[PDB]
Structure 1
Amino acid sequence: NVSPEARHPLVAAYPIVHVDMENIILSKNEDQSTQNTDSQTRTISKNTS
């Protein structure tokens, strides 16, 4: 894999690696919660006066 130009004793053979970013994905950490409830009651007031 050493490229042909660098098969000469006076040309150096070395890699030039470089990282590039193609996309950035941020994900907002947040918890959310819903709640449904329903209730019935019955009072029987017996009263004297």
Structure 2
Amino acid sequence: NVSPEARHPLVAAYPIVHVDMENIILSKNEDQSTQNTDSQTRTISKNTS
């Protein structure tokens, strides 16, 4: 895989790597909940006066 114009003893053969970014996926770290409460009350009161 040494490219053919590098085969000459005077032409140096070396890799040039670089990384390039195509997306960025930010994920918001937030937590949420709900609640549902249904009560019932039975007041019974006697009252002598």
Corresponding residue pairs, total: 49
Note the C-alpha offset of 1:5: 0.4
Q: Please tell me the root mean square deviation across aligned C-alpha atoms, in Å.
A: 0.3
Note the C-alpha offset of 1:33: 0.4
Moved over 6 A (4+): none
Alpha-carbon distance in structure 2 between the residues aligned to 1:34 and 1:20: 42
TM-score under structure 1 length normalisation? 0.98
Q: Which has the higher strand share?
A: 2
Corresponding residue of 1:45: 45
Give the gaps of 5 or more residues in structure 1: none
What secondary structure sits across from 1:48 in the alignment? coil
Corresponding residue of 1:22: 22
What secondary structure sits across from 1:11 in the alignment? coil
